[PDB]
Every structure is written in structure tokens, then in C-alpha cells.
Design a protein around this nucleic acid. Sequence first.
RNA 1: CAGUCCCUCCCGCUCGGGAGGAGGCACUCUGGGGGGACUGCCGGCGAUAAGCCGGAGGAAGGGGCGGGCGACGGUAGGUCAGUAUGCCCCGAAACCCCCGGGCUACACGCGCGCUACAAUGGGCGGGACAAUGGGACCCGACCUCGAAAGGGGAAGGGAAUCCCCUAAACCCGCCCUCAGUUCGGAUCGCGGGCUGCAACUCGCCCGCGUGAAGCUGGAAUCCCUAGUACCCGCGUGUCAUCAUCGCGC
Lengths: 50, 66, 63, 102, 214, 128, 148, 131
Amino acid sequence: YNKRKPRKFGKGARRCIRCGQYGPIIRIQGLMLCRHCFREVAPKLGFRKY
Amino acid sequence: DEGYPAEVIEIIGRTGTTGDVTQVKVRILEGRDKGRVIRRNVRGPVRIGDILILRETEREAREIKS
Amino acid sequence: GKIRQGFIKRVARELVNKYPNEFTTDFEHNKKKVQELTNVTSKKIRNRIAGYVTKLVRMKMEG
Amino acid sequence: MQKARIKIASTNVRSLDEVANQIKQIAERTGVRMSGPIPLPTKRIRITTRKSPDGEGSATFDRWELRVHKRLIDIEADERAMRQIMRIRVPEDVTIEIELIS
Amino acid sequence: AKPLNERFFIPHEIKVMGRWSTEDVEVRDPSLKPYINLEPRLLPHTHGRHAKKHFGKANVHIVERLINKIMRSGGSHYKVAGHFMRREHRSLNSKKVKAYEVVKEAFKIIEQRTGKNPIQVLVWAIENAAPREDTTSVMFGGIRYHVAVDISPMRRLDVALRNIALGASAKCYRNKMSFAEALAEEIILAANKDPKSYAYSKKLEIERIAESSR
Amino acid sequence: IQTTGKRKTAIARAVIREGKGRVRINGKPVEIIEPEIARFTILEPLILAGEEIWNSVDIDVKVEGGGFMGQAEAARMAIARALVEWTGDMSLKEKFMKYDRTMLVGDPRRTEPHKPNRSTKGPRAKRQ
Amino acid sequence: ATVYDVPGDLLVERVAQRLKEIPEIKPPEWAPFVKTGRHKERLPEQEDWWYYRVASILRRVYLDGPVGIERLRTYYGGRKNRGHAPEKFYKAGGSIIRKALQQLEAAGFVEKVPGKGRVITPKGRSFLDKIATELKKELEEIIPELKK
Amino acid sequence: RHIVRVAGVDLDGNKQLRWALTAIKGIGINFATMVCRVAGLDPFMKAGYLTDEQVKKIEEILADPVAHGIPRWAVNRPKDYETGRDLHLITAKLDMAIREDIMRLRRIRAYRGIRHELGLPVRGQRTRSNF
RNA sequence: CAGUCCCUCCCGCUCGGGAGGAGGCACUCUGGGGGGACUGCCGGCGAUAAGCCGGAGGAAGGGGCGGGCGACGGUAGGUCAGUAUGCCCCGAAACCCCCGGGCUACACGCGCGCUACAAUGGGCGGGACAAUGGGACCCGACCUCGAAAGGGGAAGGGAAUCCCCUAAACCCGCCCUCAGUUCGGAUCGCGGGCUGCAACUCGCCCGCGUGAAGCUGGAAUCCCUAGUACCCGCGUGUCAUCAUCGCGC
């Protein structure tokens, strides 16, 4: 009864792996991170501003 | 159409309440005051040698007070 | 925004003081000489130094 | 006749050129015809994100770009040549895929 | 497509658009001479960066400039007699091919209605539709006052062509009548100094008021 | 002779040889292309070159990319360059320059990127 | 001479008037009541519109070689207004072009390469280039420059 | 014939027949087109020549469209509630059918019933600032 | 059919036209580098300096084009409803789980985008056309059935290899004839399609009778200035669907 139902679709299925929010999860080739968390890991991922 | 053509021969400097009007020295080429040099106000971009057309030869401009 | 930067005006004076005979009025020549004499990696600053030394060498003989 | 198609991919251009030079030197020292490194279309991964951490503020956005570059090396088949591409010192970021084509 | 191919092959002997070479056409008032580009060119379209040139627009052909005015005329702050002018349905904006075809029909209409070189009649309309004096506000001691001011020739061209285009929009809007026939009327009425034409009437309005503000 | 032409995105590749005067755009005759204005633009350099060289050489041009206007302008560039290279004549080049400055130069213009804040309507478009 | 040397409009008109005679090509009983495309707003006006479709579709098989139904739908698609929402580009109907292709396939003019598309038989090429060279003769007479 | 009556309503002869039937509440553009094509006559001809035999042909296509070659999806109310047969309602027939549906929805107390009662939208439209 | 012996197909006026294989690497192209281009020079201006103007030559020229890069403090701006967290508060609750509804509710005020306010026009048919990126329960070509949304099968594809693939703008052969209508579809009811446990609150689309207001809008009013304004569309992020949105082409 204390289990969360199994969802493959919708926001409740997708969660950011770092922060844990249920909101903005960019999935370009499988990142699983929130949109703002993406900035605190930008330069470790190899990304560079141009 | 009793208009008088004339030639821009010198530009004193940009004038007018917004910098659009240009104070030009224009020499009359055809009319009663043939050859008179008068400071006249021009709207629209102007150069040296442009054929202005004038309604009144009597009109002049006050000296710019910088 | 023409103005040649300060450190270019500083570099060129020394460059032409040490090797005055090396430089002439030709821009490509003085540019190659700046390239071989200095260690600039930016092509643009190399050519700017070339232009300023071109003008400098030009003034050397005018007075 | 048989050819080996070697696809090298990396982010830093210098590592890819290093491995290309090593492969070219090895192919020429082994005396094997090698089709030179063909630089394939670099893939540009572009991501846009709003810089505002909250709903308050002017809408400012930032675009970041990965330029992942790739090269193709088609060499002729030679076992002595194929024994000297597993011993090459490969930088970590460089990925190499070596397939065979009739 | 035979009319199309006929108009394709006729200007093989360098004729503006299709026909009516620029040699027979002259200029009457001495002021427009160095600013109207009457050079023989097959198409009135250069895609040129004459805006970047402070005065390089003088090199653009007159018909090209006329289309340049015609294609940007819809939707603005002017409500002449309380109307809102706008190209809601297939706007000419960015559709310079539509403008090309429409002013092509305009040339045809002026041919079949006057029987003369269209460029000559266009010269007539622009020469007769140019205002020659305007009003300017000057303040001294806080004392704003109006002043009669002469106009530059290039602005006279700009305003004349703008009257032509704005008239074409004005009559063509809200009527069964079509754009080309309207442009033909504005041109022919200005070329004969017909005051019913908006171009000549507003040339008269701008010349007046400035006439009295001396 | 092989010649190149670039306008925005369209690219024109032209091959000029001796022949009856058969000029073909992507394999199609120049006289049948439905846009008449594009037909004018394509025909301008060979209008100005002369009937003699028009009939003397054969030019095959393939145009790819851009729009039809870009294709036509790139084709115009290609015919101009092909004619001047085939003849190698200075007077034709100077007439081409006098007609317009791009016939051997071209248009170095390219499109700007769409900046943020309502990027949809263009680069320099913002909200109200 | 070939289709490539002649205009598309005139050639499709010639193929349409010529194929109107052939009995294997016919508009189905549901053709006069169903518009040529989803995106279309009104019904077709002329009653020959079916044969034109055939006259065009075979021409497509003359140019692209293997053709299928979905790509034909995307090509024949067009812009439809969505009321308060903006105009949008939509695909056309599929059954009409599928029936036209089947009728042509029974006509022997086109054939099926399973797993690659519908291609054009040599007989279809002969008929199309015969009409095209007919038109090229006519337009050579009209326009001598086409001799080149 | 400048004035022509068909199925109890008046039409003008100037407009073409497909456009002429458009004045029938119970015939549209596509519907008029396909019925006049079922009739074998171009819908483009002017409605001033509508002869009586063709008029009653159009009438009996309105009466029983399905038996005239028309498919079942071109009617306004296919699979009618009280019969289960696809039919095309004309004039007061449509009006009574929609009245019956309104009363039926109110009777069952569906959401649409109360929306229709209040003159309110049905399909999820938002009332904060529009309307 | 860049030139194209040889081979294949079709046609012709027998000139040749077009297409593939053979084989080549020709132009752009993809990308490893360098040059060119720099107040470089003419003249003037400017103290002869700085630097400016005009000129020519050059593909491109006197901050080459657009950005990344916005220091010191202030606004006690917003963000503890995300991350680290001062402090306080609940502890079968100020905990957790499950579900029905709500977050979409309206006499209404305001902002921003989308469209409708036709003869430029709506409808049939032809044709010149890209491009950013994406695709594995996916791109899905393609065979076949069903109007159709789609179903059965199905090649290729984890990226210059296959698909999304069509761009859109445009012109013409033709039809309609200045009308709240052949504009425009909201608004209803019907019957079908996709998704998901399921969409009436709470998806859209496919076709059917139906057709709102709107037919150019006051004081006043915001912003762009050369590949730019105007204007026109494609794609994709997030994502089964939902955005008329944002992004960027």
C-alpha cells in the first residue's frame, strides 16, 4: 500500500537524478537531469559556451 | 508653376529642431534675382550641386546662434 | 573604433627601435617580419602590428 | 581484395589528429595502401536553456554546443597491419571502430 | 505560355522588363536628372545594399524603387478619411514576385490606354507630383513657430513615389476594382496634373500650408 | 571549362563546351522555366554576351539548394563566369561590371541567426 | 527527346487527354464524391481531375523510379487553414492515389518492386517520351531555340 | 426561372446549382455537389433552368440519399438515435432532432445538458476572459 | 550523360535527348591548415599626433559581420515550492499512501500570441525549390486493405549510407464574379481514428446539415532600421496527446 504506482508516461514517471524535482527533465540522448541542475554540471560534461 | 530652380553650392551645417533640416547656401540660377546666394533650409538629404526649387526669392534664414 | 590599442603602440616602438632597417613601407613584408620576430598567435593582432609599423615606417622618412 | 574501415571519433581535435597520424605512420611503415583520413560531418549537439532559475526576470537563454568530430580511414587488408592498431596508445576521449568490408 | 515566352525573348536586345527601351525616354525638370536611374537593365531588381550607402539609392532604377514603395504599403498610422489600409490577404510583403506581376499588368494597362512609352509617362507623373515646399517647427526662447522650408530633390522623389503607392492602396482597398487598374489611374492622373489624383492633391496640400506659414 | 556559383544557399555548377547553343538548367531548357522573372535573370549574362557566343558554346548547369530565385541568380553567376573563362575577354568582363558589380564578384550576404525573446519572426524581433 | 526537355504543364495535359481514351483508367464510383485531399476545402470542379492525377502520378514514376503511397501523399499535400489557429501543411488522400497506381499497374505502365516502391516499365517510358518528343516537335516549331 | 422552389424553400437562378442548393438549410456545398453528381448533372449550371423532373430527382435524393449511391458518412446524422439507420435530416427535421437531443441531455443530467441549459460552452473552452 | 571507350533502356528530326551500370575523381560539399585583409595607399581634414572624411584598388575594408565574455555597488527585487542552509513548527500529525473533484471553474477588467474581417481573393491541375536537427517499443521507406485518422506484412537505418522528406513563399491552363457570401470557421449533434487504466470537468484529428462576430477600428499607443524591417513557412526541444507557445532553421 506504501508503493507508488508504475508509470512509464507523464511527468510523474520522469524525475531528475540529481535534484529530484518532477519538472524539467531534458532527455537529449539520455541525460535525466533538471534544466537548472544542468548549469551546475555544464563544464564537467564537456560543454563549452560559444 | 512659377518656381525658381537654384543650385546648392555650400552647406553651412545641419539645422532644424531635430537635425533633419539642413541649412544650405544656394545660388539662384533662373529668375529675377539671377545669381543671388542665399542661405535656405532644405528638408531631405542634400549634397553639393543639387537642384533645389524655390517658391520665394525673398526668404532667408536667421544666422544660427550656437 | 579605429584607435590602435595601447600595447600595440608600445610593442611597435620597441620593434622598430631594435630593427629599424628591417622594416619598410610594404605591409605584407613588415607583417611577415612581425610574424617571425614576435610570438603573436592571433593573425589579427599580427596584422594590426603590421599596419601600425607600416604607418610608423612611413613617418620615419617624412620628418 | 578486402578493406578495413576505421571510424575514429572524439571531441578534442588534437587527439583525433594524433591517432590519425599514428595510423598513417603505421600504415606507411607497414607499406600498406591506406585511404587517407576523411573528415566526416562533425555532429553539433545544441542545447538551449533559460538562465532564470525562477519565473521572475527577463527571459534570458543560453545555448551550449558540443562539436563531436569523426574521421574515416579505409585501409587495405593486412594482418601485420591489423596487429598494430590494437597496440596504439589511444587517448580516453577517442573512440575507434574497426570494421571489415569485402 | 506563349505570351510568357514572347516577353522572355523580346528583351533579348536589353529592354527594361520586356519592352520600351530607356533611350526614347527623357527627363524634363532639371532636378531629377542625377537621381533617377534610367540605365538600361533587363530586371528592376538588384538586391543591393543601397540602404547601407548614404546616397547609393540614386543608382537603383526608378521602377525598382517604385516597387520598393509599393510592396511596403499596408498597415500604418495614417487613416486617410478614416480608413485602415492593410494587406490582410496574401500581402505583397516579401512577395516581390506578386508586385512584379502586378506592376507588369500596370505597364500593360498604361500601354493600352495611352499608347506611349510607359517610362515617359512615369517621368511625367513624378515630375508633376513632387511637392516643393513644406513646414518646419523652430523654437527660440521657447517660442515654437512654423517656417516655410524648401525640400531636397531626393525627398521629392521619395514622397512622389510614396504618393503613387499610397494611392494604389487607397483606391484598390475595399473595392471590386483591382490594384493594377488603380495604379494606372494614379499614374495617368498625376501625369496630367489631375487634382483628383491623391498624389497631386497632396502635393498641393504640402505646398500650401507651407505657402501660408511664412 | 567548369565554373562555380554561390548565392545564399543555392549552388550552381556549370560546364561549358563547344556546341550548337544548347543551354540546359538541371537538364531543362532555359526558355520553358515557368517563372518569367527567373528566366530573365538566368538569361541576362547570355543576353549581354552576344548571339555569336550564345550559339557557339554549349553550357550545362546544375543548380541545387535555396529557392528558385537563389537558383536563378546562382545560375546567372555560373553562366557569367563560364562565358568569361571560355572567352577570356576583358571587354566582356568590363561590360559585365558596368551592368552590375556582382557578375564576377557575387553577393557575400548570408542569413543571421534567430536571437531569443520571440525568435520566431526573425533575428531582430522582440515582444511588445 | 524526353519529358525533361518539355514543360510539365503541357506534358501532363497531353498525357491526360491521351489516357482519357484508355479503358483501364477510370474514376471509381466514389471518386466524384470524395475530394482529392484532406487539406482541400471544396470539392474538385472539373470532372477530368481523376485522369490528371493519373497523368501526373505516372510522370512521378518516370522521374523518381520507385514510388510509394505515403510520399505521394506528402507531395500532393497542401496548406489548409485551421480557423483561429494558423494554416498548417497536411497530407492528401491515400486511397485515390492508391487506386490510380493500381489502375496503372493493371495498365502495364507501372510495376511494383516489393520493399522498394513502384517503378516505371519500359513501355511506360516509351509512351511518356513519345508524348514528350511530340510536344518538343511542336514547341520547336513554336520556339526554334528548342532545336538546341 | 429567376425564382425556383425545391423542398419547401426558395433559391435564385443566378447562382450555380451547387451554390443554389446551399440556401437549403439541410444541404451544404459538398452535399449539393455530390447529390447533383449522383443526378448526373454538372452542379455548375445556373439554377434558372431547373426543370421539374430534375427538381423531383433532387427531392427524392434528399428523401433517401443512401439508396442513391451516397455513402453513409456524408449524412449529417449517421446512425440516427431512434432508428439506427443513417439519414440526412432536412429543415424542421434537423431542428426537431437537435431539440430532442437537447431535451434528452437535460433529462439524463449530463454535463452537456447543464451547459446547454445555461447557454454555456461544452467542449472545455475557458471562460476567464473570452466570450 | 563534368569528359565518359565498353554494357543496358527508351525515343527521335537521326541532329541527337534523357536515364543507369562500367570507371573516374572533376564543382559545391564534409573537414585537418594557411593566406588574403591591414587607415594598405592617394588627397584632404585634423598640431604634421591621435584619429577623421572622400577616393581608388581589392570578393570582402577606417571598432569586417553577430555573439560568449557585463567589473564596483545598488534594487533589503525573486527564488528557503530544488538543490547547501540560519531559525521555528507538526510527529500517526503540519507524516505518508489510495482514489472522486480542482488547479480548465465566469456579469467581468487587463497583457501577450493565433486567426477572421477577400477579388491580392476561394477552388482544380502542373511545375523552381531548401534547411536546423532528430529516429530503436523509434524514423519508419515500401507492398496491400480501408475515404480517412489507420490496420496486416515489410526493407534499411544507433547518423554525409535508411527514414522523418513534404518545405513554404511563387507563376500559370481554367472556374467563380464584390457578396457577412462560394470569405471565415467559432458555436452544436452525428459517425469513425490514435494514445493511454481511463479524456464529459479532461486531448486532438477525420467527414457530414450548420454558420457567430468580424466587412478596416477614437484619444492614445509599443518596437526594427540591410539579409535587416516587412512577410512566409519547415523542424525540433519538453513530448502518446496537449503549445495558437518557447526555441532555432
